[PDB]
Design a protein around this ligand. Sequence first.
Ligand SMILES: O=[N+]([O-])c1cccc(-c2cc(Cc3ccncc3)cc3cccnc23)c1
Ligand SMILES: O=[N+]([O-])c1cccc(-c2cc(Cc3ccncc3)cc3cccnc23)c1
Ligand SMILES: [Mg+2]
Ligand SMILES: [Mg+2]
Ligand SMILES: [Zn+2]
Ligand SMILES: [Zn+2]
Lengths: 371, 370
Amino acid sequence: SNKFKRMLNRELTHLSEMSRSGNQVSEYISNTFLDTSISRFGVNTENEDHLAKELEDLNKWGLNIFNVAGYSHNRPLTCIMYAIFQERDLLKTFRISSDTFITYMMTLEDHYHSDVAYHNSLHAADVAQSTHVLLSTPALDAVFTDLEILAAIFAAAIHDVDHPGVSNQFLINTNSELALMYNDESVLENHHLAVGFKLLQEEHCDIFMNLTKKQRQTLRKMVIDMVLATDMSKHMSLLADLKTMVETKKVTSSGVLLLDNYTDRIQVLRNMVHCADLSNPTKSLELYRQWTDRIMEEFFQQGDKERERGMEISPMCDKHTASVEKSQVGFIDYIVHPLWETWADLVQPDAQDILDTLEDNRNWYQSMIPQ
Amino acid sequence: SNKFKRMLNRELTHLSEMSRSGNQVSEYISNTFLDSISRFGVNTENEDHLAKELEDLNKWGLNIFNVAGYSHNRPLTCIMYAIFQERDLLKTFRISSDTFITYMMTLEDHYHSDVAYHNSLHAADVAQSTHVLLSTPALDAVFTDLEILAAIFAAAIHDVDHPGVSNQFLINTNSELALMYNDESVLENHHLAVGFKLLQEEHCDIFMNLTKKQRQTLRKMVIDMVLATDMSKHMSLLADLKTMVETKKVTSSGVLLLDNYTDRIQVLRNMVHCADLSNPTKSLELYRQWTDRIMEEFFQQGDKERERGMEISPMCDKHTASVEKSQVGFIDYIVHPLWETWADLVQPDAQDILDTLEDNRNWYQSMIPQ
Ligand SMILES: O=[N+]([O-])c1cccc(-c2cc(Cc3ccncc3)cc3cccnc23)c1
Ligand SMILES: O=[N+]([O-])c1cccc(-c2cc(Cc3ccncc3)cc3cccnc23)c1
Ligand SMILES: [Mg+2]
Ligand SMILES: [Mg+2]
Ligand SMILES: [Zn+2]
Ligand SMILES: [Zn+2]
């Protein structure tokens, strides 16, 4: 659609001229978004009661994933994934032993880096838990098969495995081996998928051993589609497709969405995990503020690596010139809010408290803008 | 004193036999503690917000995180220029704003931003706390300006170029730095070298206008103070501070009597040491943030150790921490004893500092699980 494209670049030109704040946010958007305990929980802990209290939020959008990390000896991913699989009865359905499951989930957690401020197992655990809540949205809850539920949640788990804490564009600009291996197109996301699936081959880790061949093939395609869709530069095209889907949606009976073909189904799932990935500003302000401070830490360190190298500092990576408050407002106004508004429309009446929390958070960061 | 060494050994033995948790805290202790531009010095357009945070310059409660926030992440440059304006040190030592900001920016730039705790934020915190501690009524008339300058500069540079790993990791991994300094005070020697080496940069010689004798005395005092921040020297500094307390003299205006260089430097080095260990004495919002940072830095070191197939040093294993219990041990066995001794030396001064420590301690105990 040339109209949407013409409209997009208009919206960003105007922002780019509002102020130097808007220029830095507008440069960022274009370069980013455009093309008993070990079996009770998955984990050893002598805090079984504090952990059991936190995990009562398993199905709530307000689950505090930071506290889970605290009471799980810093295994928020293994712990949450075990909880989701118990909750949805996925181990039994797919004949996965708890043993194989925990060994895989520990190996996966281990390949997330804890020295990366944001793209580490905590973020993986949050995105997986948020996907778990989203899959229970009433308009979809009856729609997806368990194979699709498994694919989505696994997708979420692995979606950033082995992330180094720098962007696809830095990896291309520094001529990384990874950029070289994947020919500059979706560098990290291809890698996340490779690692996640490669790890099944490790000893006692094939959590899909007991699926049929046709099941494995369907899972793998679904998962590849979802993770490649977390590539941020695909954001505008994903939102375009979601909007056209809203305007031509079919409700069946009792509020449920009609998704006949594979295309319709994967489009929704991949927007779902994409939404999970951008759910930080829709969570409670305590949660959201921690996430912001982490991503900025990570952007700033990329900025220093650029500076060490004599490269030009990327937008939002200069610690000496960021405006974190104005940037958050822009990010909500121009990316998070449009995406979540469209999602709310697809799945109405759901997502509305999510949308209201999003405005509170946005208004809090506005209230904190000096001058 | 052999009876101090025996007593010290006794309490740590009792501690490690208490439980798994006390074992690990006791292993830790033994391995660690025994042997716009015109106005603020930074360019910001948050001149109002920054000015308000900086009204706490002379208070224990200053929030250095917010200062970082309003100073475009130049907390050290900003705080140091505030302290130096406050005490009129730039005029007194004829240091120009150009020379001073250029040095301070260069110094701040050599603290690593990718290190969770030992960055310019911690340096700025320790600098501001030294500044507050130097105004303790019992000492406040005692020290000359050269001594004040040394102590504050010492604090500024005390961890510059810290790589986020411990003296023992550097020895165990055969670091070039451990090779250079022969396994003794590796980082602290390095911090001093860098801090002084940086005066030689273009427009950075902030001590250019001091006399030779002044430069010589300042350098001796600074070296003394920074080597003193070596954690492995903790117990012998405390032992000295305790025998200082028991043999203390006071003029009458409530002011301590410090004639010789030895008693003077002994206070100055316990002061910066106490500033370095002040996190748990601060308000709870601040201390929580510091704990989380130092724990991140230990955990990363632990992963580097695991990446190398070494055994994971105490407190560096992310899968076997008990942060809450560890903070309570830290306070009972290291922070509280030190500050209690400090409070005695300078009484009635450090008494709320000390009550805050109790509050913080008890909050961390109230969060211990089960
Ligand atoms: O101006 N902004 O739009 C702007 C400014 C500062 C931060 C962000 C931002 C991007 C992303 C998604 C993401 C993650 C990793 N790489 C790229 C994008 C996630 C975020 C989560 C919390 C806070 N900020 C975020 C956006
Ligand atoms: O139980 N503990 O003793 C224990 C457990 C966990 C953390 C600490 C700890 C040590 C040091 C001083 C330090 C800084 C850098 N390297 C070595 C020591 C400073 C701290 C500041 C805030 C919180 N914990 C700290 C102590
Ligand atoms: Mg990603
Ligand atoms: Mg140090
Ligand atoms: Zn992600
Ligand atoms: Zn220090």
